[PDB]
Each structure stands twice: as structure tokens, then as C-alpha cells.
């Protein structure tokens, strides 16, 4: 059995059993995160010890715990007590989100604010959001959620269309107290409905779209064995699923003739922040850490055939844990399919009379998650020529506010009185590199322009320059689209036939990084987002750019701390962390449901192969 197989329902149940038996899962205990641990560095280690990491929360206010259990041995290997005011709070629980609206509904200050606006409390939905760390000392060590109101006129109504601005509440979800209710002033509540399924808004539906039928009369070209091991057009990998990170790809390799060569040991989106740029006290604290605080895999959708994934699909239904350790399956939560990708190679040669054309293909592995108003699709692609690519698709309903009379520098208008605060969606890809094995290195490649003169008398010459990042103190890099900056990960001990170290080149989209002032909380807490590329020496406990406990953590966790070690990355076991995102100034066409916008990156072989790896592709 493979060490990278997906967690079984019974394994979750076994973890539950081991925890209750050791008296660590009592009636006041809640599981805020549960995930299988990856195998440690080894190869001839056939003694498989299946271990799970669990973050246990306590509803009574008692210190939480980080527990490591061996589902194979049936034992608790570790169980450490956490000082959350030092190391941050655990991920927020679904039941904690539910308590915010309920608690506010009986609070005198909240009911008063709602009375002044003439809104029926039973019609007021509250978005229970992360708190972050600002200037409220009484929150340290406490689990707080901040709430924003939205009106829902009827059950099928889209509450996002009616934000109740000038109002924000802070709630302690363990002691169940409303710690603060801020009412900065009354703002009209946007009246227009944003119901995209309402025939009064859509108008007569189109009857012009003819069907596009994509089928595979002989089945797919990939094989799925061991439940999650994929073999497709020379590629090999294992598809994992974590409740925090979502789809994770393991042991990405390419079979170059005789040998199966490694490229990436582990690929995942390790964090994803959505910071808001509205300086209003009602929203200036708003920063979603979708992966770290909310756990994206937890909210993964059950994809529908023909609607979400068209063609010959192969699904994976991963299993996660609930707050009590019971297994929960996300049916059809991962899509796997190959799709046509146009022309791969083409040449019509005059001299030889040979006309050659080959088509391209990509293997797609994806999932879609929903974080409140927003829905995100995470797509990983493998191409015939050895290219690896990631694409994030953002959709959903934009987060709203009121549009200030007299306009705004930080909010855009979507409808009459309806605003949409400026924000960004910034992702972090954790790429545990293994180019032909673990002895890797990273170089920054810049285009070099040359000046006209001796050796370049016609002033036509241009070159390139590569700088090797040797220590971690020099591995925090910035993009430079102007000079065509890319980063090559190579194995200095593995050469191609021309005796140059094999490599892969990372092509970024060069979008803007974190815009927030460098001294702000979010800049401290999401420091990874301020730079485009980070390279660290691998360490088993360094899994997230924002750290293990993001919720209400002070700042400087994850990447800045890891880098501070200043380890040797020149020809070592390294990890590449690429920051990429969308800066969003919502437009009128993003209402009342926004069309997909995308971001991503890709890695292309750079002298990895001896010649083109697609010469054996047939005609057809």
C-alpha cells in the first residue's frame, strides 16, 4: 500500500478512537484540524507508520492541544499544550460561525443599531469573519470573530446586495459574549436585489447556445491506481487532499525513457489571503486567510457532472473529519480529466516537403471551494511537453458595502448605493522541489541588454544573466517583468547531454504583490505576500508561509521566521514559495455574480531533457 494514499474513513474513526481512549476527546473537546502526516525523508523505509496531526480545541476555555497519533500502532505519539496568546489560535470551527448571529440577536446594542435602520432582526444575516490582531489587548488569548450585517428580504434572497454599513460587532465565541458593537453612523441599505436566478433581472434566458459535446469513446489516457496514483503521458504523481490546503500533489515525476525522473516532491497552495483596502473602521480589519483560518478543503464543493466538469471525468471523494472526529466524505470533490490543448508543434518545410502538425493535451486535477461570498477553483495542469501549471479561478458574489455619497478612493460602485471595497486575492504555492532528486539550487535569470560598441557594433546583441541564491538571507525575491525575470531550479549534480545541470524555469504572471503599508498588521501576518518568490531549506515542520496557527497570531510567523535561520540553499533539499494574486477593483460587470477571473504560474523544462520529450507523440 502506498504511503501517499488518501486517508480512509476508518482511519479518521481510528484517530477518534485513539483520542477518546486517551481521554483527549471529551465532551468539551473539538477537532479544529485533522490531517494525515507526510512520510519523513527516507526511501528504503518500508516500515510504514501512518500518522495524523490533530489540533484539539476546548469549549471550556482550557488550553488547546497539538496531538500526533499513529493510526498504525494505535498510540498517541505526542500531545502538546498550546499557549495561543503566543503561538496563535486554532482554526475557526463551523459551529463558532453559527453562534455569532444568534448572540447578536439578543444583544441590546445590536438590536438598537438595527432599530435605528428599521431592519427586522430576523432578516439580518451576519457574516462571521476572522478578527486578526489589532489594538484590542483584551482579545489576546481569546477567540474572537467580527461580524458584518447583510439583509435577506426573503429566504431565496441574496443578502450580499444589502450590506448594513456603519455597523460592526466583535464576539468572543468561547465565553459567548458580544464584546463590542460599533455604530459609526447610519448608511442607506442598498435596495436593489442581486438575485441572479430571478427572471426579472435575467430577462428571457438565451436560446442561442448549441451544445458542445466532449467525449472519450475509449476512456481516458490516464490510469488511477492505489486510489490516488496517476499515470498519464509519461507523468506520474499522487493526488492528496488535506482539509487545510485542499488538493496536494505528491511525487510529480516524468518517465524519460528508462528512468522515472523526479521534478516536484510536493506541490500545494499553502496559504491564500484576501486583504481589504477600505480604511473604514467597519472593514479595516478585514483579511481572510482562507487556507489558514478557514481551511479551504473543508468547504470543497461536490462537483456535478456536466456542470462543473465536462467530458470524461474521474472523481476522487476524499474524507475529512468533523468537529468530533467522525469521518465526512466530500463526494465528487476532486475532478480528474485530460483535455485537448490545441497545437503542440507545427512546421511546413519548403525544402523537405514535410508538413508536420501535432496536438497538445493537458491533465487537469481540480477542486472548487466556497468561503462565504467567494468561490475559488484550484486547477493543476500537466502538459505533454513537461510543463506544469497552476491556475486559480475566482468567482462568487463580491463582498459589499455602501457606496459613500461623494464617492470613494477605496471602494467602487456596483449599483445604486451599493459599494464594493478594493481588495486582493493573493496565493502562495509551496513547491517542495526535487529536480532529478533533492540536490537542488535556484538562480534568478534576468535579460541583459548590451550597449553598442566593440563586439556589438550594430547594437543588436542581448544576453541573459543567472544569479545563484546561496543562503536564505538572499532568497527573498521580487519580480521584474521589464527585464524578463524568471527563476530556474536546477540540480547541479545532474547534467544533460550538453553537460549543463538539468533545470525547470518558473514563469510568474508578475501581478502586484501585497499593497498594504509595510507596518500594518496584515503585512506582518502575511509577509509572504509582500514578495514574489522565497526559497527555504526544507524542514519537516515548515509547512505554511503563515505558520501553523494563523488565527489571531500577532505577526512574523511562517516565512520570515524560516528565512531568519539563513540556511544553505545552494545544492540542498529546498522549497520554493511563489506568491501570486489578483488586485481587485470590482467593476459593474462583477455584479451581481462575478464572472471568473484567473491568476497562476507555470514551470517549463529548462534543459531538463536531451531534446524535445514530445517527438514520440503520434499523428492522429
Q: Which of residues 569-588 bind a second copy (CB under 8 A)?
A: 583, 585, 587-588
Q: Which entry of Cu ion, a second copy, none binds 608, CB below 5 to 8 A by partner kind?
A: a second copy
> Nearer Cβ to a second copy, position 44 or 203?
203
Q: Which among 333, 336, 334, 359 is positioned nearest to 346, based on CA atoms?
A: 359
What grid cell was written down for 113? 443599531
- How far are the Cα atoms of 145, 211, 549, 595 from residue 208, in angstroms, in the given order? 47, 10, 50, 20
Residue 524 interacting with Cu ion (CB under 5 A): no
What grid cell was written down for 27? 465532551
Q: Cβ 21 to a second copy, closest distance in Å?
A: 35
Q: Cβ 236 to a second copy, closest distance in Å?
A: 13
Residue 604 interacting with Cu ion (CB under 5 A): no
> Nearer Cβ to a second copy, position 331 or 611?
611
Q: Which entry of Cu ion, a second copy, none binds 451, CB below 5 to 8 A by partner kind?
A: a second copy
Among 8, 70, 179, 496, binds a second copy (CB under 8 A): 496
Q: Find the binding residues for a second copy in span 551-570 (CB under 8 A).
A: none
Asked if residues 243 and 298 have their Cβ atoms less than 8 Å apart, the reply is yes
What grid cell was written down for 398? 463580491
Give the interface segment with a second copy, choosing from 58-66, 490-498, 533-541, 570-578 (CB under 8 A): 490-498
Q: Which among 398, 399, 402 is positioned nearest to 418, based on CA atoms?
A: 402
User: Known binder of ligand: residue 371?
Assistant: yes
User: Known binder of ligand: residue 177?
Assistant: no
> Nearer Cβ to a second copy, position 20 or 359?
359
User: Known binder of ligand: residue 296?
Assistant: yes
> Cα–Cα distance between 76 and 65 in angstroms, integer?
12
> Nearer Cβ to a second copy, position 108 or 497?
497
User: Known binder of ligand: residue 294?
Assistant: yes
DSSP-derived 3-state class of residue 245: coil
> Cα–Cα distance between 368 and 84 in angstroms, integer?
31
> Nearer Cβ to a second copy, position 256 or 570?
256
User: Known binder of ligand: residue 229?
Assistant: no
Q: Find the binding residues for a second copy in span 192-221 (CB under 8 A).
A: 196-197, 201-221
What grid cell was written down for 203? 430577462
Residue 261 interacting with Cu ion (CB under 5 A): no
Q: Cβ 11 to a second copy, closest distance in Å?
A: 28
H/E element, 530: none
Q: Cβ 398 to Cu ion, closest distance in Å?
A: 6
Binding mask 572-591 for Cu ion (x = CB under 5 A): ------------x-------
> Nearer Cβ to a second copy, position 67 or 148?
148
Asked if residues 256 and 609 have their Cβ atoms less than 8 Å apart, the reply is yes
What grid cell was written down for 152? 435577506
Among 8, 395, 470, 572, binds a second copy (CB under 8 A): 395
Tell me whether strands 501-508 and 594-605 are parallel, antiparallel or unpaired. antiparallel
Residue 617 interacting with a second copy (CB under 8 A): yes
Considering only CA atoms, give the Rg of the chain.
Answer: 26
Q: Could you list the beta-strand ranges (E) of 434-573.
A: 441-449, 462-468, 476-477, 486-495, 501-508, 533-537
Sign of the dihedral defined by the CA atoms of residues 449, 532, 599, 617, in that order: positive
> Cα–Cα distance between 433 and 278 in angstroms, integer?
38
Residues 539, 540, 542, CA angle at the centre, nearest 5°?
70
What residue number has its CB nearest to Cu ion? 584
Q: Find the binding residues for a second copy in span 284-313 (CB under 8 A).
A: 284-285, 287, 301, 304, 306-308, 310-311
Tell me whether strands 418-421 and 355-371 are parallel, antiparallel or unpaired. unpaired
Give the interface segment with a second copy, choosing from 67-75, 84-92, 427-435, 457-465 (CB under 8 A): 457-465
The per-residue DSSP string of 275-333 comes to EB---STTTTT-EEEIIIII-TTTTB--PPBTTTB-SS-EEE--EEE-TTS-EEE-TT-
Residue 224 interacting with a second copy (CB under 8 A): no
Give the interface segment with a second copy, choosing from 83-91, 324-332, 339-347, 545-553 (CB under 8 A): 339-347
Catalytic residue, candidates 290, 532, 548, 590 = 290
- How far are the Cα atoms of 278, 366, 405, 589 from residue 408, in angstroms, in the given order? 9, 38, 8, 19
Q: Which entry of a second copy, Cu ion, none binds 43, CB below 5 to 8 A by partner kind?
A: none
> Nearer Cβ to Cu ion, position 566 or 597?
597
Q: Cβ 351 to Cu ion, closest distance in Å?
A: 19
> Cα–Cα distance between 275 and 444 in angstroms, integer?
29
Residue 331 interacting with a second copy (CB under 8 A): no
> Nearer Cβ to a second copy, position 16 or 552?
552
Concerning whether 308 is annotated as a catalytic residue, the answer is no
Give the interface segment with a second copy, choosing from 136-144, 259-267, 371-379, 560-568 (CB under 8 A): 371-379
Residue 370 interacting with a second copy (CB under 8 A): yes
Residue 152 interacting with a second copy (CB under 8 A): yes
Give the interface segment with a second copy, choosing from 16-24, 53-61, 415-423, 547-555 (CB under 8 A): 415-423
- How far are the Cα atoms of 349, 485, 514 from residue 575, in angstroms, in the given order? 44, 19, 21
Q: Which among 382, 337, 345 is positioned nearest to 614, based on CA atoms?
A: 345
Q: Find the binding residues for a second copy in span 79-118 (CB under 8 A).
A: none
> Cα–Cα distance between 433 and 537 in angstroms, integer?
10
Residue 589 interacting with a second copy (CB under 8 A): yes
Number of chain positions touching a second copy (CB under 8 A): 154
Q: Which entry of Cu ion, a second copy, none binds 522, CB below 5 to 8 A by partner kind?
A: a second copy
Concerning whether 290 is annotated as a catalytic residue, the answer is yes
Among 65, 590, 600, 601, binds a second copy (CB under 8 A): 590
Q: Could you list the beta-strand ranges (E) of 134-206.
A: 144-151, 167-172, 177-183
Number of chain positions touching Cu ion (CB under 5 A): 1
What grid cell was written down for 166? 456603519
Asked if residues 44 and 30 have their Cβ atoms less than 8 Å apart, the reply is no
User: Known binder of ligand: residue 289?
Assistant: yes
CB atoms within 10 A of CB 330: 22
Q: Which entry of a second copy, Cu ion, none binds 584, CB below 5 to 8 A by partner kind?
A: Cu ion
Catalytic residue, candidates 276, 374, 383, 562 = 374
> Cα–Cα distance between 319 and 333 in angstroms, integer?
10
| Burial grade of 438 (CB within 10 A; 0-12, 13-18, 19 or more) | middle
Give the interface segment with a second copy, choosing from 24-32, 41-49, 74-82, 608-616 (CB under 8 A): 608-616
Known binding positions: 288-299, 371-376, 423, 425, 584
State the residues that interact with Cu ion by CB under 5 A. 584
What are the catalytic residues? Answer: 290, 374
Known binding positions for substrate: 288-299, 371-376
Amino acid at each position: 500500500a502506498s504511503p501517499f494514499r488518501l486517508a480512509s474513513a476508518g482511519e479518521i474513526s481510528e484517530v477518534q478512537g485513539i483520542l477518546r481512549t486517551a481521554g483527549l476527546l471529551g465532551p468539551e473537546k473539538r477537532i479544529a484540524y485533522l490531517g494525515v502526516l507526510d512520510p519523513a525523508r527516507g526511501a528504503g523505509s518500508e516500515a510504514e507508520d501512518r500518522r495524523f496531526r490533530v489540533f484539539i480545541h476546548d469549549v471550556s476555555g482550557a488550553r488547546p492541544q497539538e496531538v500526533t497519533v499513529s493510526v498504525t500502532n494505535g498510540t498517541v505519539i505526542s500531545a502538546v499544550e498550546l499557549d495561543t496568546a503566543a503561538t496563535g489560535e486554532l482554526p475557526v470551527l463551523e459551529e463558532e460561525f453559527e453562534v455569532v448571529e444568534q448572540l447578536l440577536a439578543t444583544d441590546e446594542r445590536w438590536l438598537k443599531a438595527l432599530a435605528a435602520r428599521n431592519l427586522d432582526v430576523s432578516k439580518v444575516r451576519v457574516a462571521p469573519l476572522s478578527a486578526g490582531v489589532f489594538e484590542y489587548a483584551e482579545e489576546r488569548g481569546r477567540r474572537i470573530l467580527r461580524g458584518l450585517a447583510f439583509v435577506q428580504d426573503f429566504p431565496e434572497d441574496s443578502a450580499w446586495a444589502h450590506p448594513v454599513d456603519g455597523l460592526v460587532a466583535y464576539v468572543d465565541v468561547v465565553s459567548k459574549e458580544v464584546t463590542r458593537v460599533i455604530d459609526t453612523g447610519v448608511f442607506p441599505v442598498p435596495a436593489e436585489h442581486g438575485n441572479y436566478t430571478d427572471p426579472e433581472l435575467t430577462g428571457p434566458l438565451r436560446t442561442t447556445q448549441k451544445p458542445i459535446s466532449i467525449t472519450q469513446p475509449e476512456g481516458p489516457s490516464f490510469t488511477v491506481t492505489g486510489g490516488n496514483h496517476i499515470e498519464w503521458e509519461k507523468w506520474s504523481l499522487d493526488v492528496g487532499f488535506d482539509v487545510r490546503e485542499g488538493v496536494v500533489l505528491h511525487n510529480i515525476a516524468f518517465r524519460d525513457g528508462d528512468r522515472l525522473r523526479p521534478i516536484i516532491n510536493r506541490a500545494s497552495i499553502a496559504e491564500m489571503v484576501v486583504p481589504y483596502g477600505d480604511p473604514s473602521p467597519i472593514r479595516s480589519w478585514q483579511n481572510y486567510f482562507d487556507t489558514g483560518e478557514y481551511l479551504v478543503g473543508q468547504y470543497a464543493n461536490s462537483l456535478e457532472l456536466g456542470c462543473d466538469c465536462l467530458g470524461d471525468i474521474t472523481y476522487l471523494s476524499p474524507v475529512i473529519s468533523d468537529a468530533f472526529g467522525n469521518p465526512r466524505e466530500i463526494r465528487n470533490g476532486i475532478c480528474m480529466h485530460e483535455e485537448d490543448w490545441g497545437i503542440l508543434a507545427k512546421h511546413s518545410d519548403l525544402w523537405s516537403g514535410i508538413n508536420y502538425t501535432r496536438r497538445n493535451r493537458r491533465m487537469v486535477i481540480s477542486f472548487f471551494t466556497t468561503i462565504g461570498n467567494y468561490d475559488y477553483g484550484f486547477y493543476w495542469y500537466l502538459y505533454l511537453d513537461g510543463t506544469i501549471e497552476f491556475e486559480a479561478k475566482a468567482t462568487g458574489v463580491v463582498f459589499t458595502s455602501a457606496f459613500p455619497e461623494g464617492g470613494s478612493d477605496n471602494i467602487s460602485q456596483l449599483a445604486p448605493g451599493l459599494g464594493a471595497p478594493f481588495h486582493q486575492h493573493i496565493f502562495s504555492a509551496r513547491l517542495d522541489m526535487a529536480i532529478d532528486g533533492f540536490t537542488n539550487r535556484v538562480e534568478e535569470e534576468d535579460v541583459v541588454r548590451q550597449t553598442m560598441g566593440p563586439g556589438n557594433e550594430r547594437g543588436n546583441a542581448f544576453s541573459r544573466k543567472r544569479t545563484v541564491l546561496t543562503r536564505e538571507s538572499e532568497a527573498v525575491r521580487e519580480a521584474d517583468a521589464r527585464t524578463g525575470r524568471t527563476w530556474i531550479i536546477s540540480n547541479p549534480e545532474s547534467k544533460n547531454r550538453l553537460n549543463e545541470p538539468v533545470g525547470y524555469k518558473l514563469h510568474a504572471h508578475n501581478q502586484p504583490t501585497l499593497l498594504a503599508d509595510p507596518g500594518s498588521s496584515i503585512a506582518r501576518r502575511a509577509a509572504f505576500a509582500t514578495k514574489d518568490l522565497w526559497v527555504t531549506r526544507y524542514a519537516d515542520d515548515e509547512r505554511y508561509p503563515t505558520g501553523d496557527f494563523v488565527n489571531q497570531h500577532s505577526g512574523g510567523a511562517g516565512l520570515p521566521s524560516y528565512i531568519a535561520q539563513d540556511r544553505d540553499i545552494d545544492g540542498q533539499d529546498i522549497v520554493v514559495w511563489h506568491t501570486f494574486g489578483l488586485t481587485h477593483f470590482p467593476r459593474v460587470e462583477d455584479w451581481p455574480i462575478m464572472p471568473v477571473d484567473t491568476v497562476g504560474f507555470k514551470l517549463r523544462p529548462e534543459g531538463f531533457f536531451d531534446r524535445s520529450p514530445v517527438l514520440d507523440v503520434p499523428a492522429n
